Amino acid sequence: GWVRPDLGELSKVTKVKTDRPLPENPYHSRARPEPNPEAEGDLKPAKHGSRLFFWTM
Amino acid sequence: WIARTFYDGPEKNYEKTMAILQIEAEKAELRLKELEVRRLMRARGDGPWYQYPTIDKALIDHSPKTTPDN
Numbered sequence: 001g002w003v004r005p006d007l008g009e010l011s012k013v014t015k016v017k018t019d020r021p022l023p024e025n026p027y028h029s030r031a032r033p034e035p036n037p038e039a040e041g042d043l044k045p046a047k048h049g050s051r052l053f054f055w056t057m
Numbered sequence: 058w059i060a061r062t063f064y065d066g067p068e069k070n071y072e073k074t075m076a077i078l079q080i081e082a083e084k085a086e087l088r089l090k091e092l093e094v095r096r097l098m099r100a101r102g103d104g105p106w107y108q109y110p111t112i113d114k115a116l117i118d119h120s121p122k123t124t125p126d127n
């Protein structure tokens with residue numbers, strides 16, 4: 001009583017019910033290095049300006 | 058008469074000198090601190106400065122690749 005599958009049927013993406021636990025680190029990755037501190041705040045004018053040689057602004 | 062119509066008192070120049078000296082000393086301290094901070098940032102790379110680009114990780118494709126082992 002076997003019925004041949006039709007066109008476009010064997011290329012379907014199906015779903016599988018398995019009891020095998022999902023691997024948590026299949027890539028065996030190490031710990032990622034922590035990012036840079038990411039400073040944030042309100043901008044204030046530069047103290048005494050550019051401070052380049054004799055320029056007062 | 059000359060002092061009254063052409064010049065001010067000593068305290069004006071005294072306190073203007075004090076203000077000027079304060080400004081210049083603050084500027085010198087800031088210059089030294091900036092040089093030290095630049096040296097540390099360039100040596101370590103942990104600050105906002107001297108950040109050199111790396112590959113963006115949003116470019117990686119996370120999909121099955123016709124081969125189970127990537």
Ligand SMILES: CCCCCCCCCCCCCCCCC[C@@H](O)O[C@H](CO[C@H](O)CCCCCCCCCCCCCCC)COP(=O)(O)OCC[N+](C)(C)C
Nearest residue numbers: 058059060061062063064065066067068069070071072073
């Ligand atoms: C009996 C008399 C004996 C003594 C004679 C004294 C002769 C005086 C002439 C020498 C003048 C000295 C030069 C002074 C110029 C710089 C000083 C300047 O700072 O003073 C200004 C005043 O400027 C003066 O008016 C300049 C006078 C220059 C003119 C000289 C007179 C003769 C020149 C000839 C002109 C042309 C004649 C016409 C020919 C056809 C005001 O500045 P200021 O920042 O507020 O001062 C702050 C202090 N306060 C609070 C007291 C005000």
